[PDB]
Structure 1
Amino acid sequence: QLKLEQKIKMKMAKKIRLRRTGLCAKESLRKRGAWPPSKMKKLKNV
């Protein structure tokens, strides 16, 4: 009885905010260098 009116909205909202948090996890990992995973697999030095 219209019991998925949450799960219509909640699903797409979750998929939005997971994208957003993914992209923000990228943005902050660019600023302090240490991004493009070629570099990260290359380096492990001390």
Structure 2
Amino acid sequence: SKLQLKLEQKMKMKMAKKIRLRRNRLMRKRKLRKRGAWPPSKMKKLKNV
């Protein structure tokens, strides 16, 4: 009974983990768009500079 509760809390940990990591990676992508340095074509072409 208790291990199933630990699996429900673990499932809450997976759902909230995927949501928080999704929000974090999208906000990193917005922080790199706002500086003007996000798209890896515009960085991979400017690897030499």
Q: Structure 2: how far apart are the matches of 1:40 and 1:3?
A: 44
How do 1:1-46 residues align onto structure 2 when only pairs under 5 Å count?
Answer: 1=1, 2-43=5-46, 44-45=48-49
Gaps of 5+ in 2: none
Where 2:15 maps in the other structure, the secondary structure is helix
Q: Which runs of 4+ in 1 moved over 2 A?
A: none
Number of aligned residues: 45
- Structure 2 length normalisation: TM-score? 0.80
Greater percentage in helix: 2
Question: RMSD of the TM alignment (CA)?
Answer: 1.0
**How high is the sequence identity, in percent, across the aligned residues?**
78
